[PDB]
């Protein structure tokens, strides 16, 4: 019991340094966040030992493109123009305890988008996939979800709604 569905993660972005509310990444199909340490090991006849190299960290994902949108166009601008982007990963169902009562547990990253591929195939809605390279230590915290996007602008049909 209490298993954690993937679709309860909310991924948010904004262009770094401009004072605007973060924009939600709609229609994610799959997602992943990776951390990996580039450790070497040094041998000696006294015995081998393992040396603590640096860590590379990256976020990756796929989404379906749609007509009421302009964000994939921003991703493909960002990868070419090397624009710095802030990003959040927010857990839509872990609320903050007190004072942060209206906020949800999150990771904050900033970094650069490093990949964007459109995939289009006959008899199919075209996907795009992207990769984002995190700078430094990601920072833990609590994040405010943009309530107007997440709960006010509900829509009927197969779009998820309460």
């Amino acid at each position: 019991a209490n298993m954690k569905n993937s679709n309860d993660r909310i991924i948010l972005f904004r262009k770094a340094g401009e004072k605007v509310d973060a924009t939600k990444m709609l229609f994610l199909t799959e997602y992943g966040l990776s951390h990996e340490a580039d450790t070497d090991t040094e041998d000696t006849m006294d015995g081998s030992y393992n040396t603590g190299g640096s860590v590379e960290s990256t976020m990756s994902g796929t989404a379906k493109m749609f007509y009421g949108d302009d964000f994939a166009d921003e991703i493909e601008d960002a990868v070419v123009d090397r624009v710095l982007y802030e990003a959040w990963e927010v857990e839509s169902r872990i609320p903050g305890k007190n004072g942060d009562s209206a906020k949800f547990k999150a990771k904050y990253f900033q970094g650069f988008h490093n990949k964007f591929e459109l995939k289009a195939e006959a008899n199919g809605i075209d996907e795009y996939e992207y990769e984002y390279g995190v700078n430094g230590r990601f920072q833990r915290g609590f994040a405010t979800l943009p309530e107007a996007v997440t709960k006010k602008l509900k829509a009927t049909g197969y779009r998820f709604h309460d």
């Binding site: 770094a16 004072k19 509310d21 802030e86 927010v90 904050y108 900033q110 920072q139 915290g141 405010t144």
Partner: peptide, 12 residues
């Protein structure tokens, strides 16, 4: 960098 909230009131 430190943590910054999603909203424009906490712009970078």
């Amino acid at each position: 960098y430190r943590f910054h909230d999603t909203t424009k009131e906490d712009a970078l």
